[PDB]
Amino acid sequence: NFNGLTGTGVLTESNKKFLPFQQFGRDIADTTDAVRDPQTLEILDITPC
């Protein structure tokens, strides 16, 4: 649960170049594939289990 966003998956460090205002990325199925950690501001990639 990241700031209200829920799901199941494996979290890894992201290499995605998020802009300073972006909080999460989206796939073609409108699923979340990356989030910004609300406390550390670290970008994490989400890979389903």
Place this chain on the structure above:
Amino acid sequence: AYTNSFTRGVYYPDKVFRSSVLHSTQDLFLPFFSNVTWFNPVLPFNDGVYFASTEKSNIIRGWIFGTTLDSKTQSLLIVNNATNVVIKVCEFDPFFRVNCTFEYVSQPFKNLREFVFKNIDGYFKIYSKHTPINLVRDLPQGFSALEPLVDLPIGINITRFQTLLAYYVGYLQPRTFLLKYNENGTITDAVDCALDP
């Protein structure tokens, strides 16, 4: 007076990371090749404003956004001073000679400055980009998207605005664009779906 907006005035429609993709979105954008007036009168705001300026002497102090722009209604005043920007909403030939509810202070903002001003869902949304150019009498060609600068949840009615002191003014329209995101999630190009066949 009037110049060619070319392909300027495109901004990031939301805050979602995308990369290596063509994304179709409908929003208020400056139409491609729209007629952009080249300029100090009070102007209509309409559905949103495209503003740009090429002053090398830091002439543009800021802007006034409201309706009657007098003691009858709440209005938004944005003023830039040394190392600071001050934004306030109060019951307010301006240029310092220019019931308060909104107080906000943040960082300040050949040198082409491009801004997009929207007033939607209670938000006065400001987008901004700063780039060097090699021309004075017109806007540059090529493509550059504007990142959001600040989202201001000031729930007021804006129909007219004035510039506090050359600058250009255009207006946004409900248009559909196909935006091209590169590998770093930067919008590098765009197609105006209603420009031509």
